[PDB]
Amino acid sequence: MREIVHIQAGQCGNQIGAKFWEVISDEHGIDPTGSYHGDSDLQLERINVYYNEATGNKYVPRAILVDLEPGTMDSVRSGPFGQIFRPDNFVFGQSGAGNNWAKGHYTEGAELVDSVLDVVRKESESCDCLQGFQLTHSLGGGTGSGMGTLLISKIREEYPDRIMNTFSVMPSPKVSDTVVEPYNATLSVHQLVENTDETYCIDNEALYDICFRTLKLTTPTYGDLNHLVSATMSGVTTCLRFPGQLNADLRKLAVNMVPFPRLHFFMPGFAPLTSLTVPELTQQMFDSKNMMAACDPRHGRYLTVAAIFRGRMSMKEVDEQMLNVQNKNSSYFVEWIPNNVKTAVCDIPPRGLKMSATFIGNSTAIQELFKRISEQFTAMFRRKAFLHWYTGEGMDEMEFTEAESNMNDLVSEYQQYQDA
Amino acid sequence: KREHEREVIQKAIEENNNFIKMAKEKLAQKMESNKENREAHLAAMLERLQEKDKHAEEVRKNKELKEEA
Ligand SMILES: Nc1nc2c(ncn2[C@@H]2O[C@H](COP(=O)(O)OP(=O)(O)O)[C@@H](O)[C@H]2O)c(=O)[nH]1
Numbered sequence: 001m002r003e004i005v006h007i008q009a010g011q012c013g014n015q016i017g018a019k020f021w022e023v024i025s026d027e028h029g030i031d032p033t034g035s036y037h038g039d040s041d042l043q044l045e046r047i048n049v050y051y052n053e054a055t056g057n058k059y060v061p062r063a064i065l066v067d068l069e070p071g072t073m074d075s076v077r078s079g080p081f082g083q084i085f086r087p088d089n090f091v092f093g094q095s096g097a098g099n100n101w102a103k104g105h106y107t108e109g110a111e112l113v114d115s116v117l118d119v120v121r122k123e124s125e126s127c128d129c130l131q132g133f134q135l136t137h138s139l140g141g142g143t144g145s146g147m148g149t150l151l152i153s154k155i156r157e158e159y160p161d162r163i164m165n166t167f168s169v170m171p172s173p174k175v176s177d178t179v180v181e182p183y184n185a186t187l188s189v190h191q192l193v194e195n196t197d198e199t200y201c202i203d204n205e206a207l208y209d210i211c212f213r214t215l216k217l218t219t220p221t222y223g224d225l226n227h228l229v230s231a232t233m234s235g236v237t238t239c240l241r242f243p244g245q246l247n248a249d250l251r252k253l254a255v256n257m258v259p260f261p262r263l264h265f266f267m268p269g270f271a272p273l274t275s276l277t278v279p280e281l282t283q284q285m286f287d288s289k290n291m292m293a294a295c296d297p298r299h300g301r302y303l304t305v306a307a308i309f310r311g312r313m314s315m316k317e318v319d320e321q322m323l324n325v326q327n328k329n330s331s332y333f334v335e336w337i338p339n340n341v342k343t344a345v346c347d348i349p350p351r352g353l354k355m356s357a358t359f360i361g362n363s364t365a366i367q368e369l370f371k372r373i374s375e376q377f378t379a380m381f382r383r384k385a386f387l388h389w390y391t392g393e394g395m396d397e398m399e400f401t402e403a404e405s406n407m408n409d410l411v412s413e414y415q416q417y418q419d420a
Numbered sequence: 421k422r423e424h425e426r427e428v429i430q431k432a433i434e435e436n437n438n439f440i441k442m443a444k445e446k447l448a449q450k451m452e453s454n455k456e457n458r459e460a461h462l463a464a465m466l467e468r469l470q471e472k473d474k475h476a477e478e479v480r481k482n483k484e485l486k487e488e489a
Pocket residue numbers: 009010011012013015016097098099100138139140141142143144145169170171172175176177181204207222223225226229
Protein backbone atom coordinates (compact mmCIF):
# COMPACT_ATOMS: atom_id res chain seq x y z
CA MET A 1 0.00 0.00 0.00
CA ARG A 2 2.27 2.73 -1.30
CA GLU A 3 1.22 4.95 -4.24
CA ILE A 4 -1.84 7.19 -4.51
CA VAL A 5 -2.86 8.69 -7.85
CA HIS A 6 -4.46 12.13 -7.55
CA ILE A 7 -6.96 13.52 -10.06
CA GLN A 8 -8.33 17.06 -10.02
CA ALA A 9 -11.24 17.96 -12.30
CA GLY A 10 -13.00 21.14 -13.40
CA GLN A 11 -12.49 24.68 -12.15
CA CYS A 12 -13.07 24.13 -8.43
CA GLY A 13 -11.28 20.79 -8.49
CA ASN A 14 -8.19 22.25 -10.16
CA GLN A 15 -8.10 25.42 -8.07
CA ILE A 16 -8.27 23.52 -4.78
CA GLY A 17 -5.93 20.80 -6.06
CA ALA A 18 -3.27 23.32 -7.08
CA LYS A 19 -3.40 24.80 -3.57
CA PHE A 20 -3.20 21.30 -2.03
CA TRP A 21 -0.04 20.55 -4.00
CA GLU A 22 1.55 23.89 -3.03
CA VAL A 23 0.80 23.20 0.63
CA ILE A 24 2.04 19.61 0.88
CA SER A 25 5.01 20.37 -1.37
CA ASP A 26 6.08 22.98 1.14
CA GLU A 27 5.58 20.48 3.98
CA HIS A 28 7.71 17.84 2.27
CA GLY A 29 10.43 20.36 1.44
CA ILE A 30 9.77 20.20 -2.31
CA ASP A 31 10.32 23.47 -4.22
CA PRO A 32 8.46 24.55 -7.36
CA THR A 33 11.14 22.94 -9.54
CA GLY A 34 10.59 19.57 -7.88
CA SER A 35 13.85 19.81 -5.93
CA TYR A 36 14.08 18.72 -2.29
CA HIS A 37 15.54 21.20 0.20
CA GLY A 38 14.25 19.90 3.53
CA ASP A 39 16.08 19.22 6.80
CA SER A 40 14.09 16.29 8.21
CA ASP A 41 14.11 12.66 7.15
CA LEU A 42 10.42 12.42 8.03
CA GLN A 43 9.82 14.56 4.93
CA LEU A 44 11.02 11.91 2.48
CA GLU A 45 10.19 8.65 4.22
CA ARG A 46 6.75 8.39 2.61
CA ILE A 47 7.16 11.00 -0.14
CA ASN A 48 6.56 8.30 -2.72
CA VAL A 49 2.91 8.10 -1.69
CA TYR A 50 2.22 11.35 -3.57
CA TYR A 51 5.34 11.94 -5.70
CA ASN A 52 7.26 10.05 -8.37
CA GLU A 53 11.03 10.45 -8.55
CA ALA A 54 12.75 11.66 -11.70
CA THR A 55 16.35 12.03 -12.82
CA GLY A 56 18.40 14.35 -10.64
CA ASN A 57 16.53 13.70 -7.40
CA LYS A 58 13.44 15.44 -8.78
CA TYR A 59 10.03 14.75 -7.28
CA VAL A 60 6.91 14.98 -9.46
CA PRO A 61 3.35 14.89 -8.12
CA ARG A 62 1.40 11.79 -9.13
CA ALA A 63 -1.29 14.16 -10.27
CA ILE A 64 -3.61 14.35 -13.26
CA LEU A 65 -5.26 17.68 -14.15
CA VAL A 66 -8.53 17.41 -16.06
CA ASP A 67 -10.85 20.01 -17.51
CA LEU A 68 -13.23 20.53 -20.43
CA GLU A 69 -11.91 24.06 -21.06
CA PRO A 70 -8.31 25.38 -20.89
CA GLY A 71 -8.71 28.48 -18.69
CA THR A 72 -8.21 27.19 -15.15
CA MET A 73 -5.37 24.83 -16.03
CA ASP A 74 -3.59 27.59 -17.96
CA SER A 75 -3.81 29.51 -14.66
CA VAL A 76 -2.52 26.53 -12.71
CA ARG A 77 0.38 26.15 -15.11
CA SER A 78 1.17 29.84 -14.55
CA GLY A 79 0.77 29.52 -10.79
CA PRO A 80 3.46 29.22 -8.08
CA PHE A 81 4.05 25.46 -8.23
CA GLY A 82 2.63 25.13 -11.74
CA GLN A 83 5.87 23.92 -13.31
CA ILE A 84 6.06 21.01 -10.84
CA PHE A 85 3.33 19.00 -12.57
CA ARG A 86 4.02 16.51 -15.36
CA PRO A 87 3.25 18.39 -18.61
CA ASP A 88 1.74 15.25 -20.17
CA ASN A 89 -0.69 15.04 -17.25
CA PHE A 90 -2.69 18.13 -18.27
CA VAL A 91 -5.66 16.67 -20.15
CA PHE A 92 -8.20 19.18 -21.39
CA GLY A 93 -10.86 19.99 -23.96
CA GLN A 94 -11.96 23.33 -25.42
CA SER A 95 -15.74 23.37 -25.39
CA GLY A 96 -16.47 23.65 -21.65
CA ALA A 97 -19.28 21.92 -19.74
CA GLY A 98 -21.66 24.89 -19.18
CA ASN A 99 -22.26 24.03 -15.50
CA ASN A 100 -24.11 21.04 -16.82
CA TRP A 101 -23.75 17.53 -15.36
CA ALA A 102 -25.11 16.00 -18.58
CA LYS A 103 -22.37 17.69 -20.63
CA GLY A 104 -19.72 16.44 -18.20
CA HIS A 105 -21.08 12.89 -17.88
CA TYR A 106 -22.61 12.01 -21.26
CA THR A 107 -21.51 14.28 -24.11
CA GLU A 108 -18.49 16.64 -23.82
CA GLY A 109 -16.94 14.59 -21.03
CA ALA A 110 -17.51 11.31 -22.83
CA GLU A 111 -15.38 12.58 -25.69
CA LEU A 112 -12.38 13.37 -23.41
CA VAL A 113 -12.52 10.61 -20.82
CA ASP A 114 -10.48 7.91 -22.63
CA SER A 115 -7.50 10.27 -22.89
CA VAL A 116 -7.73 10.91 -19.13
CA LEU A 117 -7.80 7.13 -18.51
CA ASP A 118 -4.70 6.76 -20.67
CA VAL A 119 -2.78 9.07 -18.36
CA VAL A 120 -4.26 7.43 -15.28
CA ARG A 121 -3.12 4.06 -16.63
CA LYS A 122 0.41 5.37 -17.30
CA GLU A 123 0.69 6.64 -13.70
CA SER A 124 -0.79 3.43 -12.26
CA GLU A 125 1.62 1.34 -14.32
CA SER A 126 4.68 2.83 -12.63
CA CYS A 127 3.29 2.08 -9.16
CA ASP A 128 4.97 -0.67 -7.16
CA CYS A 129 1.70 -1.15 -5.24
CA LEU A 130 -1.13 1.28 -5.98
CA GLN A 131 -3.40 1.99 -2.98
CA GLY A 132 -6.01 3.86 -4.97
CA PHE A 133 -7.11 7.26 -6.12
CA GLN A 134 -8.02 10.65 -4.72
CA LEU A 135 -10.21 13.03 -6.71
CA THR A 136 -10.79 16.73 -6.03
CA HIS A 137 -13.89 18.33 -7.61
CA SER A 138 -17.07 20.30 -6.99
CA LEU A 139 -20.51 18.71 -7.33
CA GLY A 140 -22.28 21.91 -8.45
CA GLY A 141 -20.67 22.51 -11.86
CA GLY A 142 -20.42 20.39 -15.01
CA THR A 143 -16.87 19.04 -15.37
CA GLY A 144 -15.88 18.15 -11.81
CA SER A 145 -19.39 16.91 -11.10
CA GLY A 146 -20.41 15.16 -14.33
CA MET A 147 -17.07 14.25 -15.81
CA GLY A 148 -15.53 13.62 -12.37
CA THR A 149 -18.20 11.00 -11.56
CA LEU A 150 -17.90 9.50 -15.07
CA LEU A 151 -14.15 9.08 -14.41
CA ILE A 152 -14.85 7.44 -11.05
CA SER A 153 -17.10 4.86 -12.71
CA LYS A 154 -14.54 4.03 -15.40
CA ILE A 155 -11.70 3.88 -12.88
CA ARG A 156 -13.71 1.46 -10.75
CA GLU A 157 -14.34 -0.71 -13.81
CA GLU A 158 -10.63 -0.88 -14.56
CA TYR A 159 -9.33 -0.98 -10.94
CA PRO A 160 -12.20 -2.53 -9.01
CA ASP A 161 -10.04 -3.62 -6.08
CA ARG A 162 -8.54 -0.21 -5.38
CA ILE A 163 -9.79 2.49 -3.01
CA MET A 164 -11.57 5.58 -4.33
CA ASN A 165 -11.47 8.69 -2.16
CA THR A 166 -12.87 12.14 -3.03
CA PHE A 167 -12.75 15.66 -1.74
CA SER A 168 -16.12 16.84 -2.97
CA VAL A 169 -17.21 20.50 -2.73
CA MET A 170 -20.95 20.74 -2.10
CA PRO A 171 -22.79 23.73 -3.50
CA SER A 172 -24.68 26.32 -1.48
CA PRO A 173 -27.08 29.07 -2.62
CA LYS A 174 -25.11 31.57 -0.49
CA VAL A 175 -21.95 30.91 -2.47
CA SER A 176 -23.32 29.95 -5.86
CA ASP A 177 -22.51 30.41 -9.56
CA THR A 178 -25.75 29.07 -11.10
CA VAL A 179 -29.23 27.90 -10.20
CA VAL A 180 -28.73 24.35 -11.51
CA GLU A 181 -26.18 23.44 -8.81
CA PRO A 182 -28.68 21.33 -6.86
CA TYR A 183 -29.46 19.26 -9.98
CA ASN A 184 -25.76 18.67 -10.65
CA ALA A 185 -25.08 17.80 -7.00
CA THR A 186 -28.02 15.39 -6.73
CA LEU A 187 -26.96 13.56 -9.89
CA SER A 188 -23.42 13.34 -8.50
CA VAL A 189 -24.22 12.23 -4.97
CA HIS A 190 -25.88 9.09 -6.33
CA GLN A 191 -22.67 8.30 -8.24
CA LEU A 192 -20.61 8.85 -5.04
CA VAL A 193 -22.87 6.65 -2.92
CA GLU A 194 -22.15 3.75 -5.23
CA ASN A 195 -18.56 4.31 -6.38
CA THR A 196 -16.47 5.85 -3.62
CA ASP A 197 -15.15 4.38 -0.38
CA GLU A 198 -14.53 7.70 1.32
CA THR A 199 -15.87 11.16 0.47
CA TYR A 200 -14.95 14.31 2.36
CA CYS A 201 -17.96 16.61 2.23
CA ILE A 202 -16.93 20.23 1.99
CA ASP A 203 -19.87 22.67 2.05
CA ASN A 204 -19.17 26.07 0.46
CA GLU A 205 -21.60 27.62 2.94
CA ALA A 206 -19.49 26.36 5.86
CA LEU A 207 -16.31 27.65 4.22
CA TYR A 208 -17.92 31.03 3.65
CA ASP A 209 -19.26 31.28 7.20
CA ILE A 210 -15.91 30.35 8.72
CA CYS A 211 -14.22 33.03 6.62
CA PHE A 212 -16.80 35.67 7.51
CA ARG A 213 -18.00 34.86 11.04
CA THR A 214 -14.78 33.42 12.46
CA LEU A 215 -11.81 34.68 10.43
CA LYS A 216 -13.46 38.12 10.16
CA LEU A 217 -13.02 38.31 6.39
CA THR A 218 -15.63 40.86 5.32
CA THR A 219 -15.79 39.67 1.73
CA PRO A 220 -14.42 36.12 1.25
CA THR A 221 -13.19 35.13 -2.19
CA TYR A 222 -12.99 31.63 -3.62
CA GLY A 223 -9.30 32.03 -2.82
CA ASP A 224 -10.07 32.53 0.87
CA LEU A 225 -12.33 29.45 0.82
CA ASN A 226 -9.59 27.46 -0.87
CA HIS A 227 -7.06 28.39 1.81
CA LEU A 228 -9.29 26.64 4.34
CA VAL A 229 -9.75 23.62 2.08
CA SER A 230 -5.99 23.43 1.44
CA ALA A 231 -5.27 23.39 5.15
CA THR A 232 -7.92 20.75 5.75
CA MET A 233 -6.74 18.43 2.96
CA SER A 234 -3.21 18.69 4.27
CA GLY A 235 -4.45 17.71 7.73
CA VAL A 236 -6.59 14.78 6.66
CA THR A 237 -3.81 13.27 4.50
CA THR A 238 -1.12 13.64 7.17
CA CYS A 239 -1.47 9.98 8.16
CA LEU A 240 -0.93 8.85 4.59
CA ARG A 241 2.09 11.09 4.07
CA PHE A 242 4.17 10.58 7.21
CA PRO A 243 5.35 7.65 9.37
CA GLY A 244 2.55 6.35 11.59
CA GLN A 245 0.47 3.52 12.99
CA LEU A 246 -3.09 4.64 12.51
CA ASN A 247 -5.04 5.12 9.27
CA ALA A 248 -1.73 4.96 7.42
CA ASP A 249 -3.30 3.97 4.11
CA LEU A 250 -6.59 4.49 2.36
CA ARG A 251 -7.96 0.99 3.02
CA LYS A 252 -7.11 0.92 6.73
CA LEU A 253 -8.84 4.34 7.00
CA ALA A 254 -11.93 2.98 5.24
CA VAL A 255 -12.07 -0.06 7.51
CA ASN A 256 -11.91 2.21 10.57
CA MET A 257 -14.34 4.83 9.35
CA VAL A 258 -17.03 3.03 7.31
CA PRO A 259 -19.30 0.59 9.13
CA PHE A 260 -21.88 0.36 6.30
CA PRO A 261 -20.79 0.72 2.67
CA ARG A 262 -23.05 3.65 1.66
CA LEU A 263 -22.40 5.75 4.77
CA HIS A 264 -18.99 6.99 3.77
CA PHE A 265 -19.55 10.74 3.75
CA PHE A 266 -17.34 12.53 6.28
CA MET A 267 -17.44 15.97 7.89
CA PRO A 268 -13.95 17.42 8.12
CA GLY A 269 -12.86 20.05 10.61
CA PHE A 270 -9.72 22.08 11.39
CA ALA A 271 -8.21 23.87 14.40
CA PRO A 272 -7.16 26.46 15.11
CA LEU A 273 -9.30 28.88 13.15
CA THR A 274 -8.71 32.33 14.68
CA SER A 275 -9.15 36.01 13.80
CA LEU A 276 -2.44 27.39 21.85
CA THR A 277 -2.78 24.50 24.33
CA VAL A 278 -3.80 20.87 23.80
CA PRO A 279 -7.14 21.42 25.61
CA GLU A 280 -7.96 24.40 23.39
CA LEU A 281 -6.99 22.54 20.21
CA THR A 282 -9.15 19.65 21.27
CA GLN A 283 -12.22 21.72 22.12
CA GLN A 284 -11.95 23.72 18.88
CA MET A 285 -11.54 20.62 16.68
CA PHE A 286 -14.83 19.22 18.01
CA ASP A 287 -16.48 22.66 17.71
CA SER A 288 -19.22 22.79 15.04
CA LYS A 289 -17.91 26.21 14.01
CA ASN A 290 -14.69 24.45 13.01
CA MET A 291 -16.36 21.86 10.78
CA MET A 292 -16.91 22.17 7.09
CA ALA A 293 -20.18 20.48 6.15
CA ALA A 294 -22.65 23.02 7.67
CA CYS A 295 -24.19 20.27 9.78
CA ASP A 296 -24.68 20.45 13.53
CA PRO A 297 -22.97 17.41 15.15
CA ARG A 298 -25.44 17.67 18.08
CA HIS A 299 -28.24 16.88 15.61
CA GLY A 300 -26.85 13.41 15.07
CA ARG A 301 -24.45 10.79 16.37
CA TYR A 302 -20.87 9.93 15.49
CA LEU A 303 -20.43 6.45 14.02
CA THR A 304 -16.67 6.91 13.84
CA VAL A 305 -14.11 9.69 14.25
CA ALA A 306 -10.48 10.16 13.29
CA ALA A 307 -8.48 12.90 15.02
CA ILE A 308 -5.04 13.96 13.85
CA PHE A 309 -2.82 16.22 15.96
CA ARG A 310 0.21 17.99 14.49
CA GLY A 311 3.13 19.69 16.19
CA ARG A 312 5.32 19.06 19.22
CA MET A 313 3.00 18.46 22.15
CA SER A 314 2.43 16.03 24.99
CA MET A 315 0.95 12.80 23.69
CA LYS A 316 -0.06 12.17 27.31
CA GLU A 317 -2.15 15.36 27.29
CA VAL A 318 -3.54 14.59 23.80
CA ASP A 319 -4.77 11.17 25.01
CA GLU A 320 -6.19 12.74 28.17
CA GLN A 321 -8.13 15.43 26.28
CA MET A 322 -9.52 13.05 23.65
CA LEU A 323 -10.76 10.75 26.40
CA ASN A 324 -12.29 13.78 28.14
CA VAL A 325 -14.31 14.70 25.03
CA GLN A 326 -15.73 11.18 24.63
CA ASN A 327 -16.37 10.65 28.36
CA LYS A 328 -18.12 14.01 28.78
CA ASN A 329 -20.26 13.84 25.64
CA SER A 330 -20.60 10.07 25.38
CA SER A 331 -24.19 10.34 24.13
CA TYR A 332 -23.01 11.74 20.80
CA PHE A 333 -20.97 8.62 20.09
CA VAL A 334 -23.04 5.55 19.16
CA GLU A 335 -22.70 2.98 21.92
CA TRP A 336 -22.80 -0.01 19.56
CA ILE A 337 -19.38 0.78 18.10
CA PRO A 338 -16.94 0.54 21.05
CA ASN A 339 -13.87 2.77 20.99
CA ASN A 340 -14.91 4.45 17.77
CA VAL A 341 -12.57 7.47 18.05
CA LYS A 342 -9.00 6.96 16.83
CA THR A 343 -6.23 9.50 17.36
CA ALA A 344 -2.95 10.06 15.53
CA VAL A 345 -0.14 12.53 16.18
CA CYS A 346 2.49 13.77 13.74
CA ASP A 347 5.47 15.80 14.93
CA ILE A 348 5.54 18.01 11.84
CA PRO A 349 3.11 20.95 12.11
CA PRO A 350 1.65 22.80 9.10
CA ARG A 351 3.22 26.06 7.92
CA GLY A 352 2.70 29.05 10.19
CA LEU A 353 1.43 27.02 13.13
CA LYS A 354 3.13 25.44 16.14
CA MET A 355 0.30 22.99 16.54
CA SER A 356 -2.95 22.09 14.81
CA ALA A 357 -5.58 19.39 14.76
CA THR A 358 -7.75 17.94 12.04
CA PHE A 359 -11.07 16.24 12.53
CA ILE A 360 -12.74 13.60 10.36
CA GLY A 361 -16.20 12.60 11.54
CA ASN A 362 -18.64 10.04 10.20
CA SER A 363 -21.75 11.57 11.76
CA THR A 364 -25.41 10.87 11.00
CA ALA A 365 -25.86 14.67 11.10
CA ILE A 366 -24.47 14.78 7.55
CA GLN A 367 -28.04 13.94 6.50
CA GLU A 368 -28.81 17.64 6.93
CA LEU A 369 -26.53 18.43 3.99
CA PHE A 370 -28.28 15.94 1.70
CA LYS A 371 -31.64 17.17 2.94
CA ARG A 372 -30.76 20.79 1.99
CA ILE A 373 -29.75 19.71 -1.52
CA SER A 374 -32.83 17.55 -1.82
CA GLU A 375 -35.10 20.49 -0.90
CA GLN A 376 -33.41 22.79 -3.44
CA PHE A 377 -33.67 20.09 -6.12
CA THR A 378 -37.38 19.57 -5.56
CA ALA A 379 -38.24 23.29 -5.54
CA MET A 380 -37.15 23.41 -9.19
CA PHE A 381 -37.91 19.85 -10.29
CA ARG A 382 -41.58 20.07 -9.26
CA ARG A 383 -41.89 22.64 -12.06
CA LYS A 384 -39.31 20.93 -14.29
CA ALA A 385 -37.45 24.25 -14.22
CA PHE A 386 -34.10 24.46 -16.09
CA LEU A 387 -34.44 20.87 -17.28
CA HIS A 388 -34.07 21.73 -21.00
CA TRP A 389 -30.32 22.20 -20.44
CA TYR A 390 -30.16 18.45 -19.59
CA THR A 391 -32.76 16.99 -21.91
CA GLY A 392 -30.91 18.77 -24.73
CA GLU A 393 -27.97 16.47 -23.99
CA GLY A 394 -30.12 13.36 -24.21
CA MET A 395 -31.10 12.84 -20.57
CA ASP A 396 -34.70 12.19 -19.57
CA GLU A 397 -36.67 13.25 -16.49
CA MET A 398 -36.76 9.69 -15.14
CA GLU A 399 -33.02 9.87 -14.41
CA PHE A 400 -33.70 12.92 -12.20
CA THR A 401 -36.50 11.09 -10.40
CA GLU A 402 -34.17 8.18 -9.73
CA ALA A 403 -31.30 10.37 -8.41
CA GLU A 404 -33.68 12.20 -6.06
CA SER A 405 -35.00 8.86 -4.77
CA ASN A 406 -31.48 7.55 -4.29
CA MET A 407 -30.49 10.60 -2.20
CA ASN A 408 -33.66 10.43 -0.11
CA ASP A 409 -32.77 6.78 0.57
CA LEU A 410 -29.31 7.84 1.78
CA VAL A 411 -30.93 10.36 4.15
CA SER A 412 -33.21 7.60 5.46
CA GLU A 413 -30.28 5.26 6.11
CA TYR A 414 -28.50 7.85 8.25
CA GLN A 415 -31.62 8.53 10.27
CA GLN A 416 -31.98 4.82 10.97
CA TYR A 417 -28.62 4.69 12.77
CA GLN A 418 -29.36 7.94 14.51
CA ASP A 419 -32.23 6.20 16.29
CA ALA A 420 -30.45 2.83 16.59
CA LYS B 421 -24.14 1.81 -17.06
CA ARG B 422 -21.98 1.97 -20.20
CA GLU B 423 -24.97 0.85 -22.27
CA HIS B 424 -27.00 3.71 -20.76
CA GLU B 425 -24.20 6.22 -21.49
CA ARG B 426 -24.25 5.14 -25.12
CA GLU B 427 -28.05 5.45 -25.29
CA VAL B 428 -28.03 9.00 -23.87
CA ILE B 429 -25.56 10.35 -26.40
CA GLN B 430 -27.22 8.59 -29.36
CA LYS B 431 -30.53 10.08 -28.14
CA ALA B 432 -28.97 13.53 -28.12
CA ILE B 433 -27.67 13.01 -31.65
CA GLU B 434 -31.04 11.71 -32.84
CA GLU B 435 -33.00 14.66 -31.50
CA ASN B 436 -30.57 17.20 -33.01
CA ASN B 437 -30.75 15.46 -36.40
CA ASN B 438 -34.53 15.32 -36.18
CA PHE B 439 -34.68 19.03 -35.32
CA ILE B 440 -32.61 19.81 -38.41
CA LYS B 441 -34.65 17.51 -40.64
CA MET B 442 -37.93 19.00 -39.46
CA ALA B 443 -36.71 22.58 -39.91
CA LYS B 444 -35.42 21.75 -43.39
CA GLU B 445 -38.68 20.07 -44.44
CA LYS B 446 -40.93 22.77 -43.01
CA LEU B 447 -39.00 25.48 -44.80
CA ALA B 448 -39.14 23.57 -48.08
CA GLN B 449 -42.90 23.15 -47.77
CA LYS B 450 -43.36 26.86 -46.95
CA MET B 451 -41.27 28.10 -49.84
CA GLU B 452 -43.06 25.80 -52.31
CA SER B 453 -46.51 26.78 -51.07
CA ASN B 454 -45.55 30.46 -51.22
CA LYS B 455 -44.18 30.18 -54.74
CA GLU B 456 -47.32 28.40 -55.94
CA ASN B 457 -49.52 30.99 -54.24
CA ARG B 458 -47.78 34.06 -55.63
CA GLU B 459 -47.63 32.56 -59.11
CA ALA B 460 -51.35 31.80 -59.04
CA HIS B 461 -52.06 35.41 -57.94
CA LEU B 462 -50.02 36.72 -60.86
CA ALA B 463 -51.69 34.31 -63.29
CA ALA B 464 -55.15 35.39 -62.18
CA MET B 465 -54.23 39.04 -62.77
CA LEU B 466 -52.84 38.41 -66.25
CA GLU B 467 -55.89 36.30 -67.08
CA ARG B 468 -58.15 39.26 -66.24
CA LEU B 469 -56.01 41.64 -68.31
CA GLN B 470 -56.08 39.21 -71.22
CA GLU B 471 -59.89 39.07 -70.99
CA LYS B 472 -59.84 42.84 -71.40
CA ASP B 473 -57.90 42.46 -74.65
CA LYS B 474 -60.49 39.95 -75.79
CA HIS B 475 -63.24 42.45 -74.96
CA ALA B 476 -61.42 45.27 -76.77
CA GLU B 477 -61.24 43.14 -79.93
CA GLU B 478 -64.96 42.43 -79.58
CA VAL B 479 -65.71 46.17 -79.39
CA ARG B 480 -63.69 46.99 -82.53
CA LYS B 481 -65.35 44.07 -84.31
CA ASN B 482 -68.76 45.38 -83.24
CA LYS B 483 -67.96 48.84 -84.62
CA GLU B 484 -66.95 47.33 -87.96
CA LEU B 485 -70.16 45.29 -88.28
CA LYS B 486 -72.32 48.34 -87.59
CA GLU B 487 -70.36 50.29 -90.21
CA GLU B 488 -71.41 47.57 -92.64
CA ALA B 489 -74.85 49.18 -92.75
N1 LIG C 1 -14.51 26.28 -2.75
C1 LIG C 1 -14.51 26.59 -4.07
N2 LIG C 1 -15.64 26.39 -4.78
C2 LIG C 1 -15.65 26.69 -6.11
C3 LIG C 1 -14.47 27.21 -6.76
N3 LIG C 1 -14.77 27.43 -8.06
C4 LIG C 1 -16.06 27.04 -8.23
N4 LIG C 1 -16.57 26.63 -7.05
C5 LIG C 1 -17.88 26.06 -6.78
O1 LIG C 1 -17.96 24.93 -7.70
C6 LIG C 1 -19.29 24.85 -8.21
C7 LIG C 1 -19.26 25.21 -9.70
O2 LIG C 1 -18.48 24.21 -10.36
P1 LIG C 1 -17.13 24.48 -11.13
O3 LIG C 1 -15.96 23.75 -10.53
O4 LIG C 1 -16.75 25.94 -11.30
O5 LIG C 1 -17.60 23.85 -12.54
P2 LIG C 1 -16.74 22.91 -13.52
O6 LIG C 1 -15.51 23.59 -14.04
O7 LIG C 1 -17.76 22.52 -14.58
O8 LIG C 1 -16.42 21.68 -12.70
C8 LIG C 1 -20.10 25.87 -7.45
O9 LIG C 1 -20.74 25.25 -6.35
C9 LIG C 1 -19.09 26.92 -7.03
O10 LIG C 1 -19.47 27.64 -5.85
C10 LIG C 1 -13.29 27.39 -5.91
O11 LIG C 1 -12.24 27.82 -6.41
N5 LIG C 1 -13.39 27.07 -4.62
